Amino acid sequence: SYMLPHLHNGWQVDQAILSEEDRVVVIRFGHDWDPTCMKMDEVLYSIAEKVKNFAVIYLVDITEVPDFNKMYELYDPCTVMFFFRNKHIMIDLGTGNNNKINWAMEDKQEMVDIIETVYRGARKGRGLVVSPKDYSTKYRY
Template sequence: MSVFLPHLRTGWHVDQAILSEDDRLVVIRFGRDGDPDCMLMDEILYKVSESISQFAVIYLCDIDDVPDFNEMYELYDPMTVMFFYRNKHMMCDFGTGNNNKLNFVLSNKQELIDIIETIYRGAIKGKGLVIAPKDYSYTNKRGL
């Protein structure tokens, strides 16, 4: 659990975070704060938070404490990162078949910065779906 990034403690707080930003991308990590994947991703999110603060804001939300969105956003993975811009869910094609969310841990801080920046650039152009700067499909990971 990251003590440095703001936690959204209720469904109302999640809604307000998404609704209140007019010019920045809202990045929310959904998951269980004690889960190892969440802790790894929280560390990367914290490391990039200052670099992206001009165009994105990051929040954390424990899905056990705030189950309001689990069914709506299909939050079944141990760790999920979702993106919102001007109260609109932003989708990104990572090559994994799931365009609604990022549900794998990134180990590289620059990769996450690139993803967030790509989604932000697409959002300000009015796109609802953007293509990730890198293909994260299983076949690509194997080098095929």
């Protein structure tokens, strides 16, 4: 949360999405103080170095940067969104919202798998990638 790079205005988010040409930009829209956001940010920090080759992770404060709240529907407590070559990438998570990940994921391997799948699909030119795990159920038993 306090270790990952932070974007402080809409122009910085624009440049961060535009700058990367061979890596998927992973942006967490939310608040540092949000417990869901703290879990998501600590998972991202855990996998921040491992995905250095094919991913860059930034953190955006929606209260400080409400520039994308209207278009991206950034109204959930936490949101994770992927961009590739200035192009939002959708994920068939099975949750009904393919445009974003709007919950905290516990396992750090699942996020790595999602980023890897997004990178593969986007480099192949796709705009939608089917996630390796179906999140229509939390698999709680």
